[PDB]
Amino acid sequence: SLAPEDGSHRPAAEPTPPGAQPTAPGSLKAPDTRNEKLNSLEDVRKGSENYALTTNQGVRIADDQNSLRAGSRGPTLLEDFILREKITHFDHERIPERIVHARGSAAHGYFQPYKSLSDITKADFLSDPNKITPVFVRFSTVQGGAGSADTVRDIRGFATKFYTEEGIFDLVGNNTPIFFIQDAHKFPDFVHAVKPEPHWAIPQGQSAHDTFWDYVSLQPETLHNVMWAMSDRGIPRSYRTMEGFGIHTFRLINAEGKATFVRFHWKPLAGKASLVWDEAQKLTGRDPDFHRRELWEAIEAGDFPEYELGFQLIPEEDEFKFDFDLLDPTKLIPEELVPVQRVGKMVLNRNPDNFFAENEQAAFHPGHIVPGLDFTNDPLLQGRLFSYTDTQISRLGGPNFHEIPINRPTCPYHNFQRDGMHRMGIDTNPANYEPNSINDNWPRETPPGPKRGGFESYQERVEGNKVRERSPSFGEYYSHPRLFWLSQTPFEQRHIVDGFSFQLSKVVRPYIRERVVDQLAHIDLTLAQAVAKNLGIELTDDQLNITPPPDVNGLKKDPSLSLYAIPDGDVKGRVVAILLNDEVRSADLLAILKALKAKGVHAKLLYSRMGEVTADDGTVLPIAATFAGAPSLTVDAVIVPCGNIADIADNGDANYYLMEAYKHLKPIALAGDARKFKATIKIADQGEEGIVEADSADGSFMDELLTLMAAHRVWSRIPKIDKIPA
Amino acid sequence: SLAPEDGSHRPAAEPTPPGAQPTAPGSLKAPDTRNEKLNSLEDVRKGSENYALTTNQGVRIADDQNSLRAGSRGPTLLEDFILREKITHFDHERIPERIVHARGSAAHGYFQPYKSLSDITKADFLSDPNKITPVFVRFSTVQGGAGSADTVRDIRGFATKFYTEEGIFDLVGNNTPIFFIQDAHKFPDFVHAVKPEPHWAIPQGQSAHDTFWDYVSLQPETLHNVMWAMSDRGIPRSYRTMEGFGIHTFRLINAEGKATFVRFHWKPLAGKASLVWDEAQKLTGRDPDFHRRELWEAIEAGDFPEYELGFQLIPEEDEFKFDFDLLDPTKLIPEELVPVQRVGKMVLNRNPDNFFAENEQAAFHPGHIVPGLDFTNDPLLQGRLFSYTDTQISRLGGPNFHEIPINRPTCPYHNFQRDGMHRMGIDTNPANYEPNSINDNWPRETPPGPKRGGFESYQERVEGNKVRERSPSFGEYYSHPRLFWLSQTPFEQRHIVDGFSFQLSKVVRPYIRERVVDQLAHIDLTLAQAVAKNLGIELTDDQLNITPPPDVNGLKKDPSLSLYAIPDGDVKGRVVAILLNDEVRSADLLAILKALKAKGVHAKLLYSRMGEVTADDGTVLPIAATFAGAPSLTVDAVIVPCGNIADIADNGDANYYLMEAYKHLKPIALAGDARKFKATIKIADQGEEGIVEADSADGSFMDELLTLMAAHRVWSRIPKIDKIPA
Ligand code: HDD
Numbered sequence A, B: 001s002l003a004p005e006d007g008s009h010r011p012a013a014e015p016t017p018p019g020a021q022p023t024a025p026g027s028l029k030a031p032d033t034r035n036e037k038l039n040s041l042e043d044v045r046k047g048s049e050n051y052a053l054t055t056n057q058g059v060r061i062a063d064d065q066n067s068l069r070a071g072s073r074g075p076t077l078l079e080d081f082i083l084r085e086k087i088t089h090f091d092h093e094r095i096p097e098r099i100v101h102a103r104g105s106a107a108h109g110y111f112q113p114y115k116s117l118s119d120i121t122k123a124d125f126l127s128d129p130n131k132i133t134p135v136f137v138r139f140s141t142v143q144g145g146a147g148s149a150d151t152v153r154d155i156r157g158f159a160t161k162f163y164t165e166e167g168i169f170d171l172v173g174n175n176t177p178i179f180f181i182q183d184a185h186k187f188p189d190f191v192h193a194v195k196p197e198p199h200w201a202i203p204q205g206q207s208a209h210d211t212f213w214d215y216v217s218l219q220p221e222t223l224h225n226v227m228w229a230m231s232d233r234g235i236p237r238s239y240r241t242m243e244g245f246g247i248h249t250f251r252l253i254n255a256e257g258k259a260t261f262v263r264f265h266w267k268p269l270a271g272k273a274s275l276v277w278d279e280a281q282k283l284t285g286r287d288p289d290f291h292r293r294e295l296w297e298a299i300e301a302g303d304f305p306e307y308e309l310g311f312q313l314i315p316e317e318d319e320f321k322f323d324f325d326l327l328d329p330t331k332l333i334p335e336e337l338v339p340v341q342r343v344g345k346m347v348l349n350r351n352p353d354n355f356f357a358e359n360e361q362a363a364f365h366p367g368h369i370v371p372g373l374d375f376t377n378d379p380l381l382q383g384r385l386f387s388y389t390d391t392q393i394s395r396l397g398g399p400n401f402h403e404i405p406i407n408r409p410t411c412p413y414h415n416f417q418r419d420g421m422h423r424m425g426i427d428t429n430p431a432n433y434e435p436n437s438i439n440d441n442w443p444r445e446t447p448p449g450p451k452r453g454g455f456e457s458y459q460e461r462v463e464g465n466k467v468r469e470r471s472p473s474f475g476e477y478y479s480h481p482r483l484f485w486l487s488q489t490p491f492e493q494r495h496i497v498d499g500f501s502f503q504l505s506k507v508v509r510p511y512i513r514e515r516v517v518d519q520l521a522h523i524d525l526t527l528a529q530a531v532a533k534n535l536g537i538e539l540t541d542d543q544l545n546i547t548p549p550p551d552v553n554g555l556k557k558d559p560s561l562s563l564y565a566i567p568d569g570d571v572k573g574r575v576v577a578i579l580l581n582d583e584v585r586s587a588d589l590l591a592i593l594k595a596l597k598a599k600g601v602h603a604k605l606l607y608s609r610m611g612e613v614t615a616d617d618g619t620v621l622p623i624a625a626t627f628a629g630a631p632s633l634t635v636d637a638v639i640v641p642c643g644n645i646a647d648i649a650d651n652g653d654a655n656y657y658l659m660e661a662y663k664h665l666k667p668i669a670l671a672g673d674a675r676k677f678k679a680t681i682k683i684a685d686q687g688e689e690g691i692v693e694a695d696s697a698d699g700s701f702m703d704e705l706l707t708l709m710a711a712h713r714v715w716s717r718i719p720k721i722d723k724i725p726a
């Protein structure tokens, strides 16, 4: 026995806040959190405690420390089957990563609709508010490999596998409502342009390089999702604080056979929130696993990620009533024109047990639909339907990937398909063909019907010649980028301009910069002029005179496109750093900690070393991390209680902690003599908005701090931060 | 034509300094740089200019922008074979990454020995100083995935494939002279402990987590290579500025059949140099491709990486004469006991054309030896011989991986092996077996001899019973860690203390930190106490009484184990940041650039925006990057010329650039009114060693800067940097 005698090696099987206990496999951390998919995985879950170590053939091993040799300093023998099995399995652990969205973090949960949607769709999982559907959800970046960093600037994937009673439905979406390109035939061109360049394989997890902006400058259909990536949408604070979208128009089909067009949304119940660039980029260094870690720890704390599914619904007769084509995936449907109707709630409430087996091997594919749904002719969706089945043949080793446990349906599946690599199911049917008489034709086809019927495609009329031709209705590139720009707050616009300026600064061929600036001049001249100034480029007279693109169906803004214009802050699950000193005023710390706990806000006690410090009254304070070990990047706010401020006041790390939090627009609260830190951040005696300060942490100090946290960041500080050397 | 009329899309095919031209495929950047292996890849090199776009079957494509559909807003048709081929190939682009050392950067070059080694080895590639052997070299980290960052704390790989006239020899080494474990049977346990933990797949690129330190604490054989890893050897400045080692004792076999034991070394001719931890960790966020980039750009500039191959030779009769076992890969052979004999020079002088084809698919394996070399019974090397062939069957898709162009021998290869997936060679031999009469027994075995003979193993005597047992001679774990600690300078010892402190502070289970501090107390009580203080652990009386391990064969230190104890600086290929203002004093800039060019040191001109600025004499200066875009982390030294200093005197990013460089111990030079920046970094009027200052930048000013850069960093500043908040 090598475990400590006090049992401190094993995390408690109860919800605990981030950092309080080591993290564990979900079934050991939360054994009573159950759903029908999690229970169905029990046939393959493997324990370990009290069992003998064996080969994969069940032979007990006596010595797992040594190879078999001829003498204890002699050569290794070929007859060592125990060594060779163990090193063979090791040698073949890796499988190909996903071509795109290779970097991702996943969790188990459940979905329930708010009311039956039987009037608009016959989909069984939406038919009854008491029908619970298990889900598995994977969030991801796009460009980087599986070992790249989480808080890069990039689009994020948001993929949900619903294990329904009539089939698996995968809703495979991203966190922006459009994509970069119009037709799937260009997807390898676009992805090869954003990915690391082919001669040297640089840069990882970044679009800030010549080939991406060469392609963008030559393909103005990309400019709308480029706008979203350059905004703070491209750097979410967490997977819990971003929107999701299916992007394409799909169809709902009800039992009377009526089709309604639909676009799918997920609303984050934790609100929308993003990092600022300098913080995101620094965080890819200090904690490249920050979003993976944050998701896992929220679930362990009981801060479950929750999202509301909603639908934009357009009747078939209104297909042509907009200035843009509903089938064009570079266009959004403004919520001012078609509101999102709330449909039901998804809660993610359990981590996987093994990341490879459940996350790495999961396969999502937007062609996995169920009766009550159907596709449209969007030409990006149409090509996606080919790709996701094809790519699993190499990634997951063959055509039996639906037998890997995470991908298995929970409902029945039976057919005439046989064999393939890795075949698990042993069919007993005398027949492997239909029609057959030798098994009375079972399993049998099922007519379409209101419930539990066979799939049938909506009989949409097709009329046209066979052409490789883009619809002229798709040939408008600039009005949606402009609607996006005008919908952002002034600070969000500043952040967009800085995103394009930073990215084009890394493009080495200056002509590519110039061509991008020309495209910006076709969107909005204030944007193009501001990015041009940062690049030292002067707009020509012709550029200054480009006429702005039209409004989108009369709109000159839509606030639902902004992260922040409409307040939706939620503090639960956020975290605050508390900078300790060697003799902390304990009454300050009591007040701080209990106010935080009352609103579900976590704290991390930090100091210049690990171990403990003792407060004014003898209270022993356990230290979570050092200043340098858990930097202000990883927290939402900073609080300094009073005490012996001289302990830390000349500590460079403590001072820089506050400078960094201040640059990144985070709320900071200073009690008592911690107000001496006002000189480090240049705060005036009569103080400034976004800095909370009092003689003590009582009265309204914690309410004021918590108000600031619900507004996320102190945007009014932006003009104050440029002077600051941090 | 989409290219600019001025030709500015295409980099000049001549050596250029980093940032002067876009980077390019090696055969286009340096078409006149040749060696026999680079020529031999001409059969598979494919151009592009003036050729038509086709399918893989050679059919010209007319419209590569659209899928085929029934009408221009209609559904995609299954008969679109051009779309499906293009998307199928995309779908199957990825192959499994290497199980370890997945992150690596490679180059072509050549090697030649200084004199014939035929008295000690019959190996053909060491027989003639004028016979050149092409090589391909891959440098790597160990733990992280292929999209992880370069400047992590980790061991580095250094693998060289020599394309000899008598076969491929692969010397597959690392940058420290021992490994973590003794027997290959434990490699999957150690690798699993250092890799991301299996429930959640965190952390990437980092050993600072509970499982790694759990295994270390329970396996004291690991402590010697852990010490190197926690030292600044864990964070090299460049792959050009680290040592390489084959780690194991091998054998050299001469023409008379005599065996000499040998350990292989590479000496960097650019000298030994490493980052400091705060710089290295921030660089993984600001440029996760820093080492891959710096290697490619050194080769494009003509700053070719050069290494000296060296042998430690031990006669067979001296196998047992040290106080450690020569076959134990956790023991090094001190150079004070057995010197490194210089054997030859390797120069890397061309970058690949396609990273996937040449770097990703390259396969190195230490069992690829040639006549005149042989193995020993080192129990770690013996298990490696199984693994590297086995792992390529899945990674590279089958047993014909030697037919992948990068891996092909340049010498003849012929045998009776046939078939396997993606077989390229079409054999015309009537026989596929030997002995045969039908082809007069060709190809034929060849007797061993002095040159061009068949391979025969050295007839080592084997005596012992079939045991799984560790040699008792391997059971000593603390004397080499101690020798290494005592051989470091005082600043290097402080950085090792900081490396263990930072890592163990991230271990959540406190008893594991305690266990590791108890192991440290068995190596050196000063090290153990300094780590313990940072963790708030107090040594017990028993720990304070642990008797220090014995010296290694009487050695108290060996300065060849330190990076810096013996000066070996070389400034050629290093890079300085020059911080511009909008009216640069052109006389300073002239002087600076002339002195840098004389020593082969590059410069990058930086400002607060991109574009150009004009100096006092009218000279237009193009800007490489902004102060934030190319931080002080990416350079060796910072120079600020005079001019209109009020332009940048209050710029936050320029002042921070100097604070960050100062903190990281880099030389800083301030001319004229740029001396106003002394206030930001708190330098007294009288000045300080490591800050160069004068009225103008002249001969003397630059000589002093260049002398500082030859000593790499300003170690004497270390007590001054804790004050500064950066
Ligand atoms: C024609 C090819 C194609 C195109 C046009 C797209 N994808 Fe895709 N996508 C792939 C081909 C692909 C893929 C090669 O099939 C992947 C990689 C590995 C896998 O299983 O599927 C994939 C993976 C992938 C994943 C990760 C699924 C997971 O976590 O495993 C997400 C979230 C998306 N995609 C989302 C999108 C959205 C919202 C798109 C446009 C609206 C889109 N993809 C277009």
Ligand code: HEM
Binding pocket: A087, A091, B097, B098, B099, B100, B101, B104, B138, B139, B140, B156, B157, B158, B159, B172, B173, B174, B179, B184, B185, B187, B246, B247, B329, B362, B363, B364, B380, B381, B383, B384, B387, B388, B391, B392, B395
């Ligand atoms: C002994 C110290 C060791 C050193 C210095 C060493 C060095 C290396 C290096 C440098 C590479 C990367 C080669 C490249 O650039 O592609 C590598 C790959 C590998 N190593 Fe070793 N290694 C060591 C021990 C081992 C051991 C003991 C095993 C198994 C017992 C092992 C199994 C592998 C495998 C499976 C790969 C991937 C190779 C491929 O996919 O082509 N390593 N190691």
